[PDB]
């Protein structure tokens, strides 16, 4: 197939500085002038949004004082990156405010630039609960030991000895995450965000109980909103692209992956009362003559 | 009896990569053009579907805590593989989704791919009851002792001592099956699906009673539905082909098998009043001069 | 059972939840006799 | 060439050096011309692109 | 049936201190990464109240 | 050379080594030529293949 | 009757609540005669 050579920007520059993939050329004619032109239908292909990716970047220092820091870190990493059912509450929109004075008594007005600001991100993770209640236990013990304890309003870790001063600083009990919004092929990063100073806020897991024997047992949905302090720009775009260059997709074919079972079980083969067994042992094999 | 040497694909590759048996070229001049050609009618032979073969691949680990686990496994294998009157619910069709946007105002729309999905399999086995009601016994007791009991919702097996923890995981009371569609000759696998995490869902056997002495006694049929996580691809096609490589037919003849009755019973011989006995004992033997 | 998505492709994961049993609603049938013994019997049973 | 349900990503990307413009329609779309002829199959009464 | 030996926490330690039953290991691959792996579907068993 | 009612598989396949492509018509079909001659049986008036 | 679950299995315990009786709605039917005496009878009955 062939298309107009000028559909794509020849080089990424001006408002496309720092862009990663191929960016359409806005100077090609569109479909809302006098009449649409079929020669430029390729450039009408539309942007479509794809799920964002969460990358853990730093760990709380409180993990160091625990009996096993590797377990805490691995659980936090898996919860943030692989167990996240959904994420919502990311926003870095702009907002412009004007001051206005009348241009005469007839209704007209002059409007002048006053200020420009940006929105905020309020990450909200959600999970689905497993046997033994690992997620809720993890988060509740995190809050109880590395954060306030309701009865004393003091951390439970400080019950131990030797905890250094400056335990009241964010680096003690906060982590960071990098959010990347990739393209359809997940080779280039289109949007990114880097939020630090993250720890639970609002309400923790649900933890409510009831008795009813005529009602079916039900799932437990876990939700958690976090604090943050975000950055956005082009260095963050480079960081996201560097993360995305890793996690290569070469050689990966999910329609050619080997089956998780390679052969029938040993007990299954011991019964000798199946489809194959009748042919192997039951039926006579005198040969074919004709 | 000769056909175009290009009728059969020379090598299974491209879209035919991973296939087992012979595949039509799909480039021989086919009908529905200007005219049909009788030089290439061999390529007009059509696919016809064949019944599916289901192989048991795994057993539940709940059978080990019972008495006579061998009998449980043998009955499960016989039910799944041989007694199956019909099997249904298998499906892994694809599905695609697009988006739309006006191309001007005339009424022409432009579309861009958004997502691709796949269907789910919902296995449904069927059987016909035997004397003693063994199938209903089997399934009712499976559900009652390995899954739950309606009044307490607790498996009866837990009454026995020493039941290991982790009895709530699926591998304690779930099994797997491999389904294969063969070719007419039953030598090469054409499709496959590897479903695991299967146990009854919905209703069990019928369990209905009624009195009507003028009504004709009637047969019973057992329909059961199962859970499942289906896997497809080239990894499972090889597994199905390997499973079907066994159950070979070399030396098999279904028209030369010995009659299941080798001779007439001894009582019939004892009777001594019949066709052969008339010649043997009744008729005289004067000799033939004629 | 219950359900939870196994990825985004369209496959599903199921977990056993509960087991119950059906209920019986017995219904007898008769044919009336000379006099009305069945109807009398049942009506007077209910009444008294 | 279009998508894979478990990742919604074309399998061909599993090779190396696929064009960055693989997401445009010309990568994975084709064109056909439809014609209705007359009884003699010599003239095109109606056509569609 | 066979499942990975690491599905269940071997010992109840760290945030699992004091747990009574069997607690799933949280470092097993989940279904919401790049793609799910069928080798770890025993670890997806859900919680029911 | 065609189906067998109980199994629905040709009995010849009990001999190992039979080549694939046994489902095509050339394996188990034949051809005939029909001619209508004249009274002297020297000329063909009608034919069918 | 009224029901209450006898455990969580799916069984119910029933307790008698009330007993009633049906109600009759008589309906007669006739065929008119010469001069229409039936219609006159009923219509004049209603009117007067």
For G8, name the nearest residue in chain B, comparing CA atoms only: B151
**C13: chain E residues, CB-CB within 8 Å:** 31, 41, 44, 46
Across the D/E interface, how many CB contacts are shorter than 8 Å? 4
Q: Which of G5, G7, G9 to mutate to test the interface with C (most CBs of C within 10 A)?
A: G9
Find chain C residues with C-beta within 8 A of B141's C-beta. none
- The C-alpha angle B129, B134, B139, rounded to 5 degrees, equals 95
Q: Which residues of B19-37 are buried (b: 16+ CB within 10 A; e: fewer)?
A: bbbbebeeebeeeeeeeee
Please give the interface size between C and E, counted as residue pairs whose CB atoms are below 8 Å apart. Answer: 22
- Closest among A104, B247, A253 to F9, alpha carbons compared: B247
- Rounded Cα distance between G23 and G5, Å, is 34
Half-sphere exposure of B198 (CA within 13 A, CB side): 24
| CA gap B59, A123 in Å, rounded | 44
Taking any CB pair shorter than 8 Å as contact, residues of chain B touching chain F are 1-3, 7-8, 21-22, 41-42, 45, 183-188, 248-255
Name the minimum distance, in Å, from the CA of B100 to any CA of chain A.
9
Q: How many CB pairs under 8 A join B and E?
A: 34
Helix B69-81 to helix B134-142 angle, to the nearest 10 degrees? Answer: 110
Q: Which of B14, B17, B92, B113 to mutate to test the interface with D (most CBs of D within 10 A)?
A: B113
B115 and D8: CB-CB below 8 Å? Answer: yes
Q: Quote the DSSP letter at residue B35.
A: S
d(CA A209, CA B241): 52
Q: Give the Cα separation of B220 and B137 in Å (integer).
A: 14
CB B175 within 8 A of CB B142: no
Q: How far apart are CA B142 and CA B200, in angstroms?
A: 9
To the nearest whole angstrom, how far is the Cα of E36 from the nearest Cα of chain D?
8
Q: How far apart are CA B165 and CA E7, in angstroms?
A: 13
Closest Cα in chain D to C11: D6
Interface test with G, best of B151, B156, B204 (most G CBs within 10 A): B151
Query: Where in chain D does DSSP place strands (E)?
Result: 34-37, 44-48
Distance (Å, rounded) from C-alpha A178 to C-alpha A200? 17
Nearest CA in chain C to A51: C8
How many angstroms is the resolution? 3.0
Rounded-to-integer distance, Cα A266 and Cα A243, Å: 44
Helix A134-146 crosses helix A69-81 at what angle (to 10 degrees)? 120
Q: CA-CA distance, B183 to B186, in Å (whole number)?
A: 5
B221 backbone dihedrals φ, ψ, rounded to 5°? -125, 140
Interchain pair B99, A257: CB under 8 A:
no
**Closest approach of chain A CAs to the CA of G10, in angstroms?**
8
DSSP A233: S
Q: Rounded CA gap, A10 and A30, in Å?
A: 18
Burial class for B228, CB neighbours closer than 10 Å (0-12, 13-18, 19+): buried
Task: Please name which of A169, A76, A61, A66 lies closest in space to residue A127, comparing C-alpha atoms.
Answer: A76
H/E element holding A69?
Answer: helix A69-81
* HSE, side-chain direction, 13 A CA sphere, residue B216: 2
Nearest residue on chain E to A212, alpha-carbon basis: E49
Q: Report whether E24 contacts A131 (CB < 8 A).
A: yes
Give, rounded to a whole angstrom, the gap between the first and last alpha carbons of chain G. 49
User: How many C-alpha atoms does F8 have within 13 Å on its Cβ side?
Assistant: 7
Burial of A12 (C-beta count, 10 Å sphere; 0-12/13-18/19+): middle
- Cα Dmax for chain F: 52
Q: What are the angstrom distances between the C-alpha of D6 and each of A188, B116, E39?
A: 20, 9, 15
**Which of chain A's residues have a Cβ under 8 Å away from the Cβ of D25?**
41-42, 45
Residue with tokens 């004397």: B131
Experimental method: cryo-EM
CB E15 within 8 A of CB B138: no
Q: Are the CB atoms for B151 and G8 separated by under 8 Å?
A: yes
Q: How far is C22 from chain G (nearest CA, A)?
A: 7
Residues from G contacting A (CB-CB < 8 Å) are 5, 7-8
Helix or strand holding residue A182 (H, E) = strand A175-182
Query: How much of chain C is in helix, strand and coil states, percent to nearest 5?
Result: 25, 15, 60
**A73 CB contacts (<8 Å, ≥6 apart)?**
A59, A63
- With CB atoms and an 8 Å threshold, state whether A42 touches D25: yes
Biggest alpha carbon distance in chain D?
Answer: 52
């Amino acid at each position: 197939a062939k298309k107009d050579p000028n559909t794509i920007m020849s080089a990424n520059s001006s408002y496309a500085n720092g862009a990663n993939g191929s960016v359409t050329n806005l100077e090609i004619p569109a479909a809302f002038g006098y009449t649409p032109d079929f020669r430029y239908y390729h450039a009408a292909a539309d942007y479509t949004r794809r799920p964002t990716i969460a990358f853990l970047m730093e760990l709380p220092n409180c993990f160091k004082d625990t009996d096993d820091a590797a377990k805490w870190g691995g659980s936090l990493k898996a919860l943030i990156e692989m167990h996240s059912r959904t994420i919502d509450g990311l926003d870095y929109t702009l907002e412009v405010e004007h001051v206005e004075t009348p241009f005469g008594g007839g209704g007209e007005m002059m409007q002048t630039l006053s200020k420009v600001r940006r929105a905020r991100s309020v990450p909200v993770f959600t999970w689905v609960e497993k046997i033994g209640m690992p997620v809720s236990r993890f988060w509740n013990n995190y809050i109880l030991y590395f954060m306030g304890e309701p009865n004393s309003n003091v951390a439970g870790i400080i019950g131990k000895g030797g905890i250094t001063p400056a335990a009241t600083y964010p680096d003690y009990n906060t982590f960071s995450v990098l959010f990347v919004e990739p393209d359809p092929t997940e080779r280039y990063a289109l949007r990114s965000t880097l939020i630090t100073n993250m720890q639970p806020t609002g309400q923790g897991p649900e933890m409510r109980m009831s008795k009813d024997q005529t009602s079916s047992p039900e799932q437990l949905q876990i939700s958690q909103t976090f604090t943050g302090l975000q950055m956005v720009g082009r260095g963050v775009d480079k960081l996201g692209q560097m993360m995305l260059d890793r996690a290569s997709q070469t050689g990966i074919d999910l329609n050619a992956q080997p089956a998780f079972l390679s052969d029938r079980e040993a007990d299954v083969a011991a019964r000798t009362d199946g489809y194959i067994d009748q042919l192997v042992s039951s039926l006579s094999k005198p040969g074919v003559a004709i």
